[PDB]
């Protein structure tokens, strides 16, 4: 996260920290995810496409720091790794950048909801917030684009939604941004998600209920003028999510 505020997991109980073991033992942080149900997490396909081996991934819920064990956390493994069978990656735009990870503890059980391990609801068919609506993104991604280390503590910021036609103007993303993606950014471009936050939860309070409206997908640079953060429009992939669960 660029700008924003530091925070603890108790404020984002649906945030999943996904790391991956490397040949040799060392483990690094990959992307963030969202707890769909006790047994399922939903992320982005571009965080796994190049390393499709489910065994390599580790996932935590209720973890507040990057290299600390938060009281209340749970360490999981990826029972099933499902990548959208129609995904592709152009110069900037990432297509059908949505994946699923069926989790499982060493004992074989799924996630046990708690004060710091809860779920977020999927949006309903044909019902997304209007443009200009404030929403929030969470993650352990970069604080600045010139850095190389991820922040040690969890962060989060609030951004606004940008309409499809406004996002397709030339100085933005032209015909690269399609209708199965949502744009969102700070009107003053001082804060924005960034590398590290990919596949992060984009929660928007719609008509009263906190909703998972988008997954962090792509953007030009980070917090740059006329360069909104693009996300996957979850409402569209509802039939897909249903049949693959
Ligand atoms: N501006 C944002 N809000 C934002 C939001 C998301 C961002 C993601 C990456 C990034 O580096 N993503 C990434 C990481 C690993 C691989 C990858 O692409 C592969 C998938 C298909 C071809 C190579 C992208 C970089 C910058 C990002 C910036």
Coordinates of N, CA, C and O in Angstrom, one line a residue, residues 45-160:
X45 N -5.4 -14.9 -10.5 CA -4.7 -16.0 -11.2 C -3.3 -15.7 -11.5 O -2.5 -16.6 -11.7
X46 N -2.9 -14.4 -11.6 CA -1.5 -14.1 -12.0 C -0.5 -14.2 -10.8 O 0.7 -13.9 -11.0
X47 N -1.0 -14.6 -9.7 CA -0.1 -14.8 -8.5 C 0.3 -16.2 -8.4 O 1.1 -16.6 -7.6
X48 N -0.3 -17.1 -9.3 CA 0.0 -18.5 -9.3 C 0.3 -19.1 -10.6 O 1.0 -20.1 -10.6
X49 N -0.2 -18.5 -11.7 CA 0.0 -19.1 -13.0 C 1.4 -19.6 -13.3 O 1.5 -20.7 -13.9
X50 N 2.4 -18.9 -12.9 CA 3.8 -19.4 -13.1 C 4.3 -20.4 -12.2 O 5.3 -21.1 -12.4
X51 N 3.6 -20.7 -11.0 CA 4.0 -21.7 -10.1 C 2.7 -22.4 -9.7 O 2.2 -22.3 -8.5
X52 N 2.0 -23.2 -10.6 CA 0.8 -23.9 -10.4 C 0.8 -25.1 -9.3 O -0.2 -25.7 -9.1
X53 N 2.0 -25.3 -8.7 CA 2.0 -26.4 -7.7 C 1.4 -26.0 -6.4 O 2.0 -25.3 -5.6
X54 N 0.2 -26.5 -6.1 CA -0.5 -26.2 -4.9 C 0.3 -26.5 -3.6 O 0.2 -25.7 -2.6
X55 N 1.2 -27.5 -3.6 CA 2.0 -27.8 -2.4 C 2.9 -26.7 -1.9 O 3.2 -26.5 -0.8
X56 N 3.3 -25.8 -2.9 CA 4.2 -24.7 -2.5 C 3.6 -23.6 -1.7 O 4.3 -22.9 -1.0
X57 N 2.3 -23.4 -1.8 CA 1.7 -22.4 -1.1 C 1.3 -22.6 0.3 O 0.9 -23.7 0.7
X58 N 1.4 -21.5 1.1 CA 1.0 -21.4 2.5 C 0.0 -20.3 2.6 O 0.2 -19.3 1.8
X59 N -0.9 -20.4 3.5 CA -1.9 -19.3 3.7 C -2.3 -19.1 5.1 O -2.5 -20.1 5.8
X60 N -2.3 -17.8 5.5 CA -2.7 -17.6 6.9 C -3.9 -16.7 7.0 O -4.3 -16.0 6.0
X61 N -4.6 -16.7 8.1 CA -5.8 -15.9 8.3 C -5.6 -15.4 9.8 O -5.0 -16.1 10.6
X62 N -5.9 -14.1 10.0 CA -5.7 -13.6 11.3 C -4.3 -13.2 11.7 O -4.0 -13.1 12.8
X63 N -3.5 -13.0 10.7 CA -2.1 -12.7 10.8 C -2.0 -11.1 10.7 O -2.4 -10.6 9.7
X64 N -1.3 -10.5 11.6 CA -1.2 -9.0 11.6 C 0.1 -8.5 11.0 O 0.2 -7.4 10.5
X65 N 1.2 -9.3 11.2 CA 2.5 -8.9 10.7 C 3.1 -9.8 9.6 O 2.6 -10.9 9.5
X66 N 4.2 -9.4 9.0 CA 4.8 -10.2 7.9 C 5.7 -11.3 8.4 O 5.7 -12.4 7.8
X67 N 6.4 -11.1 9.5 CA 7.3 -12.1 10.1 C 7.1 -12.4 11.6 O 8.0 -12.5 12.3
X68 N 5.8 -12.4 12.0 CA 5.5 -12.6 13.4 C 4.2 -13.5 13.4 O 3.5 -13.5 12.5
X69 N 4.1 -14.2 14.5 CA 2.9 -15.1 14.7 C 1.9 -14.4 15.6 O 2.0 -14.4 16.8
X70 N 0.8 -13.9 14.9 CA -0.3 -13.2 15.6 C -1.2 -14.1 16.5 O -1.7 -15.1 15.9
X71 N -1.3 -13.8 17.7 CA -2.2 -14.6 18.6 C -3.6 -14.7 18.0 O -4.3 -13.7 17.8
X72 N -3.9 -15.9 17.6 CA -5.2 -16.2 17.0 C -5.1 -16.7 15.6 O -6.1 -17.2 15.0
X73 N -4.0 -16.6 15.0 CA -3.8 -17.0 13.6 C -4.0 -18.5 13.4 O -4.1 -19.2 14.4
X74 N -4.0 -18.9 12.1 CA -4.1 -20.3 11.7 C -3.3 -20.5 10.4 O -3.5 -19.7 9.5
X75 N -2.5 -21.5 10.4 CA -1.7 -21.8 9.2 C -2.4 -22.9 8.3 O -2.7 -24.0 8.8
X76 N -2.6 -22.6 7.1 CA -3.3 -23.5 6.2 C -2.5 -24.0 5.0 O -1.4 -23.5 4.7
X77 N -3.1 -25.0 4.2 CA -2.5 -25.5 3.0 C -3.6 -25.5 2.0 O -4.7 -25.6 2.3
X78 N -3.2 -25.4 0.7 CA -4.1 -25.3 -0.4 C -4.6 -26.7 -1.0 O -4.0 -27.2 -1.9
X79 N -5.7 -27.2 -0.5 CA -6.3 -28.4 -1.0 C -6.5 -28.5 -2.5 O -6.1 -29.4 -3.2
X80 N -7.1 -27.4 -3.0 CA -7.5 -27.3 -4.4 C -7.1 -25.9 -5.0 O -7.4 -24.9 -4.3
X81 N -6.4 -25.9 -6.1 CA -6.0 -24.6 -6.7 C -6.6 -24.6 -8.0 O -6.3 -25.4 -8.9
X82 N -7.6 -23.6 -8.2 CA -8.3 -23.5 -9.5 C -8.1 -22.1 -10.1 O -8.4 -21.1 -9.6
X83 N -7.5 -22.2 -11.4 CA -7.2 -21.0 -12.1 C -8.2 -20.8 -13.2 O -8.5 -21.8 -13.9
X84 N -8.7 -19.6 -13.5 CA -9.7 -19.4 -14.5 C -9.1 -20.0 -15.8 O -8.1 -19.6 -16.3
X85 N -9.8 -20.9 -16.4 CA -9.4 -21.6 -17.7 C -9.4 -20.7 -18.9 O -9.0 -21.2 -20.0
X86 N -9.6 -19.4 -18.8 CA -9.6 -18.5 -19.9 C -8.7 -17.3 -19.7 O -8.9 -16.3 -20.4
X87 N -7.9 -17.3 -18.7 CA -7.0 -16.2 -18.3 C -5.8 -15.9 -19.3 O -5.3 -16.8 -20.0
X88 N -5.5 -14.6 -19.4 CA -4.4 -14.2 -20.3 C -3.8 -12.8 -19.8 O -4.5 -12.1 -19.0
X89 N -2.6 -12.5 -20.2 CA -2.0 -11.3 -19.7 C -1.4 -10.4 -20.9 O -0.3 -10.8 -21.4
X90 N -2.0 -9.3 -21.2 CA -1.5 -8.4 -22.3 C -0.5 -7.5 -21.7 O 0.1 -7.8 -20.6
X91 N -0.2 -6.4 -22.4 CA 0.9 -5.5 -21.9 C 0.6 -4.9 -20.5 O 1.5 -4.8 -19.7
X92 N -0.7 -4.6 -20.2 CA -1.0 -4.1 -18.9 C -2.2 -4.8 -18.4 O -2.2 -5.3 -17.2
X93 N -3.3 -5.0 -19.2 CA -4.5 -5.7 -18.7 C -4.3 -7.1 -18.5 O -3.7 -7.8 -19.3
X94 N -5.0 -7.6 -17.4 CA -4.9 -9.0 -17.1 C -6.4 -9.5 -17.2 O -7.3 -9.0 -16.5
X95 N -6.6 -10.5 -18.0 CA -7.9 -11.1 -18.2 C -8.3 -12.2 -17.4 O -7.6 -13.1 -17.1
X96 N -9.6 -12.2 -16.9 CA -10.1 -13.2 -16.0 C -9.1 -13.6 -14.9 O -8.8 -14.7 -14.7
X97 N -8.6 -12.5 -14.3 CA -7.6 -12.6 -13.2 C -8.4 -12.9 -11.9 O -8.4 -12.1 -11.0
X98 N -8.9 -14.1 -11.8 CA -9.6 -14.6 -10.6 C -9.4 -16.1 -10.4 O -9.5 -16.9 -11.3
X99 N -9.0 -16.4 -9.2 CA -8.7 -17.8 -8.8 C -9.3 -18.2 -7.5 O -9.8 -17.4 -6.8
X100 N -9.2 -19.5 -7.2 CA -9.8 -20.1 -6.0 C -8.8 -21.1 -5.3 O -8.2 -21.8 -6.0
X101 N -8.7 -21.0 -4.0 CA -7.9 -21.9 -3.3 C -8.7 -22.5 -2.1 O -9.1 -21.8 -1.2
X102 N -8.9 -23.8 -2.2 CA -9.7 -24.5 -1.2 C -8.6 -24.8 -0.2 O -7.6 -25.4 -0.5
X103 N -8.8 -24.3 1.0 CA -7.8 -24.4 2.1 C -8.0 -25.6 3.0 O -9.1 -26.3 2.9
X104 N -7.0 -25.9 3.8 CA -7.1 -27.1 4.7 C -5.9 -27.1 5.7 O -4.8 -26.9 5.3
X105 N -6.2 -27.3 7.0 CA -5.2 -27.3 8.0 C -4.6 -28.7 8.0 O -5.1 -29.6 7.4
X106 N -3.4 -28.9 8.7 CA -2.8 -30.3 8.7 C -3.8 -31.4 9.2 O -3.6 -32.5 8.9
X107 N -4.8 -31.0 10.0 CA -5.7 -31.9 10.5 C -6.8 -32.2 9.5 O -7.4 -33.3 9.6
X108 N -7.0 -31.4 8.5 CA -7.9 -31.6 7.5 C -9.2 -30.8 7.5 O -10.0 -30.9 6.6
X109 N -9.3 -29.9 8.5 CA -10.4 -29.0 8.7 C -10.2 -27.7 8.0 O -9.1 -27.4 7.6
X110 N -11.3 -26.9 7.8 CA -11.2 -25.7 7.1 C -10.9 -24.6 8.2 O -10.4 -24.8 9.2
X111 N -11.4 -23.4 7.9 CA -11.2 -22.2 8.8 C -12.3 -22.1 9.9 O -13.4 -22.2 9.7
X112 N -11.8 -21.8 11.1 CA -12.7 -21.6 12.3 C -12.9 -20.1 12.5 O -12.1 -19.5 13.1
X113 N -14.0 -19.6 12.1 CA -14.3 -18.2 12.3 C -14.1 -17.7 13.7 O -14.3 -18.4 14.7
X114 N -13.6 -16.5 13.9 CA -13.3 -15.9 15.2 C -13.3 -14.4 15.1 O -13.6 -13.8 14.0
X115 N -12.9 -13.7 16.2 CA -12.9 -12.2 16.2 C -12.0 -11.6 15.2 O -12.0 -10.4 14.9
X116 N -11.0 -12.4 14.7 CA -10.1 -12.0 13.7 C -10.0 -12.9 12.4 O -9.1 -12.8 11.7
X117 N -11.0 -13.8 12.3 CA -11.0 -14.7 11.1 C -12.5 -14.9 10.7 O -13.2 -15.8 11.1
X118 N -13.0 -13.9 9.9 CA -14.3 -13.9 9.4 C -14.4 -13.9 7.9 O -13.4 -14.0 7.2
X119 N -15.6 -13.8 7.3 CA -15.8 -13.8 5.9 C -16.4 -12.6 5.3 O -17.0 -11.7 6.0
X120 N -16.3 -12.4 4.0 CA -16.9 -11.3 3.3 C -17.8 -11.8 2.2 O -17.6 -12.9 1.7
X121 N -18.9 -11.1 1.9 CA -19.9 -11.5 1.0 C -19.7 -11.1 -0.5 O -19.2 -10.0 -0.7
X122 N -20.0 -12.0 -1.4 CA -19.8 -11.7 -2.8 C -21.0 -10.7 -3.2 O -22.1 -10.7 -2.6
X123 N -20.7 -9.9 -4.2 CA -21.8 -9.0 -4.7 C -22.8 -9.8 -5.4 O -22.6 -10.9 -5.8
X124 N -24.0 -9.2 -5.5 CA -25.1 -9.9 -6.2 C -25.2 -9.5 -7.7 O -24.9 -8.4 -8.0
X125 N -25.7 -10.4 -8.5 CA -25.8 -10.2 -9.9 C -26.4 -8.8 -10.2 O -27.3 -8.3 -9.6
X126 N -25.8 -8.1 -11.2 CA -26.2 -6.8 -11.7 C -26.4 -5.8 -10.6 O -27.3 -5.0 -10.6
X127 N -25.5 -5.7 -9.6 CA -25.6 -4.8 -8.5 C -24.3 -4.3 -7.9 O -23.9 -4.9 -6.9
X128 N -23.7 -3.3 -8.6 CA -22.4 -2.8 -8.1 C -22.5 -1.4 -7.7 O -23.3 -0.6 -8.2
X129 N -21.7 -0.9 -6.7 CA -21.8 0.5 -6.3 C -21.6 1.4 -7.5 O -21.0 1.1 -8.5
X130 N -22.2 2.6 -7.4 CA -22.1 3.6 -8.4 C -20.7 4.2 -8.4 O -20.0 4.0 -7.5
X131 N -20.4 4.9 -9.5 CA -19.0 5.5 -9.6 C -18.9 6.6 -8.5 O -19.8 7.3 -8.2
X132 N -17.6 6.8 -8.1 CA -17.4 7.9 -7.1 C -17.6 7.4 -5.6 O -17.4 8.2 -4.7
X133 N -17.9 6.1 -5.5 CA -18.2 5.5 -4.2 C -16.8 5.2 -3.5 O -15.9 4.7 -4.2
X134 N -16.7 5.4 -2.2 CA -15.5 5.1 -1.5 C -15.5 3.6 -1.1 O -16.5 3.1 -0.7
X135 N -14.3 3.0 -1.3 CA -14.1 1.6 -0.9 C -12.7 1.5 -0.3 O -12.0 2.5 -0.3
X136 N -12.4 0.3 0.2 CA -11.0 0.2 0.9 C -10.3 -1.1 0.4 O -10.8 -2.1 0.1
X137 N -8.9 -0.9 0.3 CA -8.1 -2.0 -0.1 C -7.1 -2.3 1.0 O -6.8 -1.4 1.8
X138 N -6.7 -3.5 1.2 CA -5.8 -3.9 2.2 C -4.6 -4.8 1.8 O -4.8 -5.5 0.8
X139 N -3.5 -4.7 2.4 CA -2.4 -5.5 2.0 C -1.0 -5.2 2.6 O -0.8 -4.3 3.4
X140 N 0.0 -6.1 2.2 CA 1.4 -5.9 2.6 C 2.2 -5.5 1.4 O 3.4 -5.8 1.4
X141 N 1.6 -4.9 0.4 CA 2.3 -4.5 -0.8 C 3.2 -3.2 -0.5 O 3.1 -2.6 0.6
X142 N 4.0 -2.9 -1.5 CA 4.9 -1.7 -1.3 C 4.3 -0.4 -0.8 O 3.1 -0.2 -1.0
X143 N 5.1 0.4 -0.1 CA 4.7 1.7 0.4 C 5.0 2.7 -0.6 O 4.4 3.7 -0.8
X144 N 6.1 2.4 -1.3 CA 6.6 3.2 -2.4 C 7.1 2.3 -3.5 O 7.6 1.2 -3.3
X145 N 7.0 2.7 -4.8 CA 7.4 1.9 -5.9 C 8.9 1.7 -6.0 O 9.4 0.9 -6.8
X146 N 9.7 2.6 -5.3 CA 11.2 2.5 -5.4 C 11.7 1.5 -4.4 O 12.9 1.2 -4.4
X147 N 10.9 1.0 -3.5 CA 11.3 0.1 -2.4 C 11.4 -1.3 -3.0 O 11.1 -1.6 -4.1
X148 N 11.9 -2.2 -2.2 CA 12.1 -3.6 -2.5 C 11.5 -4.5 -1.4 O 11.2 -5.7 -1.7
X149 N 11.4 -4.0 -0.2 CA 10.9 -4.8 0.9 C 9.4 -4.4 1.1 O 9.1 -3.2 0.9
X150 N 8.6 -5.3 1.6 CA 7.2 -5.0 1.9 C 7.1 -4.5 3.3 O 8.0 -4.9 4.2
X151 N 6.1 -3.7 3.6 CA 6.0 -3.2 5.0 C 5.9 -4.3 6.0 O 5.4 -5.4 5.6
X152 N 6.4 -4.1 7.2 CA 6.3 -5.2 8.2 C 4.9 -5.3 8.9 O 4.6 -6.3 9.5
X153 N 4.1 -4.2 8.8 CA 2.8 -4.3 9.4 C 1.7 -4.1 8.3 O 2.0 -3.4 7.3
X154 N 0.6 -4.7 8.5 CA -0.5 -4.6 7.6 C -1.0 -3.2 7.4 O -0.9 -2.4 8.3
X155 N -1.4 -2.8 6.2 CA -1.9 -1.5 5.8 C -3.2 -1.5 5.1 O -3.6 -2.5 4.6
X156 N -3.8 -0.3 5.0 CA -5.1 -0.2 4.3 C -5.4 1.3 4.0 O -4.9 2.2 4.8
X157 N -6.1 1.5 2.9 CA -6.5 2.9 2.5 C -7.8 2.9 1.9 O -8.4 1.8 1.6
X158 N -8.4 4.0 1.7 CA -9.7 4.1 1.0 C -9.5 4.8 -0.3 O -8.7 5.8 -0.4
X159 N -10.2 4.4 -1.3 CA -10.1 5.0 -2.7 C -11.6 5.1 -3.2 O -12.5 4.8 -2.5
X160 N -11.7 5.7 -4.4 CA -13.0 5.9 -5.0 C -13.1 5.1 -6.4 O -12.1 4.9 -7.0

